[PDB]
Write a protein that binds this ligand. Structure first.
Ligand code: NA
Length: 129
């Protein structure tokens, strides 16, 4: 599913991301735009053989199981495929674990490069939240 901006903003809020570890909602919407273009089905393969999955481009070297990333962990206890669903629950739950791991939202390269330090409130402007 390809979310609208406010539709995603509204779902993230319901699943408890707004201000999660002190990250306001616009951070999370901005990270999703630049990671996945708001598409739950996005995948991207990395040089090290791992793959990034879903609207929040969660990596299979540490967080989910894809069966093809040798020696990797599965810290979220889930199949990677389950982060491609139209229901963003699994993505959100796993992202809460990632943002808690010590590096905050710097875990997401496109957040660091494209969202950090910008006016992230724009990403929720206009929305009925
Ligand atoms: Na894995």
């Amino acid at each position: 599913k390809v979310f609208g901006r406010c539709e995603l903003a509204a779902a993230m809020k319901r699943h408890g991301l707004d201000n999660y570890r002190g990250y306001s909602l616009g951070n999370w919407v901005c990270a999703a735009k630049f990671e996945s273009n708001f598409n739950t089905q996005a995948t991207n393969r990395n040089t090290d053989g791992s793959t990034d999955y879903g609207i929040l481009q969660i990596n299979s070297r540490w967080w989910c199981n894809d069966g093809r990333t040798p020696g990797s962990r599965n810290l979220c206890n889930i199949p990677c495929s389950a982060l491609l669903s139209s229901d963003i629950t699994a993505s959100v739950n796993c992202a809460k674990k990632i943002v808690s791991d010590g590096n905050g939202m710097n875990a997401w390269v496109a957040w660091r490069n494209r969202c950090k330090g910008t006016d992230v409130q724009a990403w929720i402007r206009g929305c009925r939240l």
